[PDB]
Amino acid sequence: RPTFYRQELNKTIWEVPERYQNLSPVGSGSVCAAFDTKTGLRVAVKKLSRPFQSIIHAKRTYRELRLLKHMKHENVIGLLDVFTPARSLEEFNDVYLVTHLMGADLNTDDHVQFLIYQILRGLKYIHSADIIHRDLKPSNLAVNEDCELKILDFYVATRWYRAPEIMLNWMHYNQTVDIWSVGCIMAELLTGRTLFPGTDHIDQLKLILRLVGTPGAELLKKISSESARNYIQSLTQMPKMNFANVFIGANPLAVDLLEKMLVLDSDKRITAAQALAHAYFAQYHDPDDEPVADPYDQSFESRDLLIDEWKSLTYDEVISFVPPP
Numbered sequence: 001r002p003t004f005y006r007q008e009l010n011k012t013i014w015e016v017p018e019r020y021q022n023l024s025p026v027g028s029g030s031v032c033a034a035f036d037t038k039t040g041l042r043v044a045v046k047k048l049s050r051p052f053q054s055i056i057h058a059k060r061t062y063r064e065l066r067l068l069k070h071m072k073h074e075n076v077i078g079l080l081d082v083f084t085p086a087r088s089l090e091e092f093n094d095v096y097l098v099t100h101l102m103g104a105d106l107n108t109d110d111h112v113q114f115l116i117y118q119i120l121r122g123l124k125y126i127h128s129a130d131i132i133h134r135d136l137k138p139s140n141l142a143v144n145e146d147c148e149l150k151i152l153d154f155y156v157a158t159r160w161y162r163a164p165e166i167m168l169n170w171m172h173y174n175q176t177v178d179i180w181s182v183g184c185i186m187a188e189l190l191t192g193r194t195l196f197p198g199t200d201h202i203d204q205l206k207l208i209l210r211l212v213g214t215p216g217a218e219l220l221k222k223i224s225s226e227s228a229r230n231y232i233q234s235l236t237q238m239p240k241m242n243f244a245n246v247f248i249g250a251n252p253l254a255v256d257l258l259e260k261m262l263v264l265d266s267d268k269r270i271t272a273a274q275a276l277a278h279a280y281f282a283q284y285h286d287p288d289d290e291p292v293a294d295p296y297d298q299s300f301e302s303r304d305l306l307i308d309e310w311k312s313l314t315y316d317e318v319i320s321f322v323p324p325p
């Protein structure tokens, strides 16, 4: 048990071990930048706000801890440490998560190549653990001075980067919803403008269909909902735009990958794994240095437990934590 020290910053109380110094707020749980005396490196510390407030909060607390303990990849946020000032389960009411400080978020062709390659390399790893990020956007991508990138999950509207099938409320979306988001981020980096700046879910889908066209016959037959089909099929039919004309001036290899990431039918979108092998990343692609994840147990997601059961499982996860070397 290390020595903790209490301190208030931005209406939030922070109780951290002595090893963490120079606590500076970055944004509000709530996050602080700090200096790790044990390693000599700058860290990011997330304090979970009211972790066991409800069954939802308690399960969410457990979910984030389980995810962060599992992620061990260069392009994904990982855990340096996890702690609590509580010395017992009974007392256990706060969770603090420690990671590498990158310094900034995401909001040259070689730059876009390097940045998107890193997203895809991190996304190949997350997707291999049967995880869907669901909220890839520039503010969920931590970037250091060296332009090295890490995928995380922390105003720039979420809806702008969301796959059209999610706007349409399809319950059976796949991992390619994340590939869509990558396509939206890549287009924005190449042009300097939000590809689809929808004001709401209806406007968002209108903007998407303007670029990718209205569904073709093969996709239309996959839509079970009568109301979704009535709405979509009542819109004026629109062809898929020529991406070479829309992204005029961009490297034609970047246009080719954009077309593969932004295909309307999710079943026809390129995967992170296939995208990493795309000609656009020839300067970076190494099939022997694009690892996959160890199996991730997400069976807990289907369970309905009491707050104290989620609290106790979280507590065991704090205790069992083993730092990286």
Ligand SMILES: CC(C)(C)c1cc(NC(=O)NCc2ccccc2Sc2ccc3nnc(-c4ccccc4SCCO)n3c2)n(-c2ccc(O)c(Cl)c2)n1
Pocket (backbone or CB within 6 Å): 026, 027, 031, 044, 045, 046, 060, 061, 063, 064, 067, 068, 071, 076, 077, 097, 098, 099, 100, 101, 102, 103, 104, 105, 131, 132, 133, 139, 140, 141, 142, 143, 151, 152, 153, 154
């Ligand atoms: C594995 C997956 C991607 C699916 C994922 C990740 C998360 N949760 C987090 O990423 N939580 C954030 C976090 C945890 C511990 C310590 C800090 C932070 S936030 C952070 C981390 C590193 C970093 N480096 N630089 C900055 C920074 C400094 C200033 C300005 C911007 C930035 S980066 C942009 C965000 O601040 N850093 C900030 N989850 C997950 C799962 C379940 C949940 O309920 C939640 Cl909330 C998250 N899933």
Ligand SMILES: Fc1ccc(-c2c[nH]nc2-c2ccnc(F)c2)cc1
Pocket (backbone or CB within 6 Å): 164, 165, 168, 170, 215, 219, 222, 223, 224, 232, 264, 265, 266, 267
């Ligand atoms: F206007 C539309 C119509 C279909 C999509 C869409 C893209 N990929 N998948 C779907 C989809 C949606 C609902 N049910 C399905 F089976 C598949 C997106 C926008």
